[PDB]
Amino acid sequence: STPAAPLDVKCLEANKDYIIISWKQPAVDGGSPILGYFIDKCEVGTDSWSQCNDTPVKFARFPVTGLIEGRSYIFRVRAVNKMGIGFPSRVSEPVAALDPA
């Protein structure tokens, strides 16, 4: 079948121009090897989800761009294989687009 949801979506680094996020791979691939992942972002006061990357990324890190300085976002990740796209991960903690210090 399709894969399981990825786990533990965390923020590695936050900046006003980009936010780097990571995740762990789902506990079940459903019989087919995983082909990649799709990352989605959402502004905290809104319910608008948008896909961040055009093609699936193979590994556990991704830099998100297209942000507005000062706004906060939450993120989710979806795994995919030849059978299809699985359920998304649990949403991450909110992260603000601001330079450190």
Residue numbers in the entry: 508 to 608
Q: What does the article say, verbatim?
A:
Myomesin is a 185 kDa modular protein that localizes exclusively at the M-band, where anti-parallel dimers cross link myosin filaments.
We explored this by solving the crystal structure of My4LH (myomesin residues 510–618) in two different space groups (data collection and refinement statistics in Table 1). While in one molecule, LH folds into an α-helix as in the My4L:OL3 complex, in the other molecule the C-terminus is in a more extended conformation.
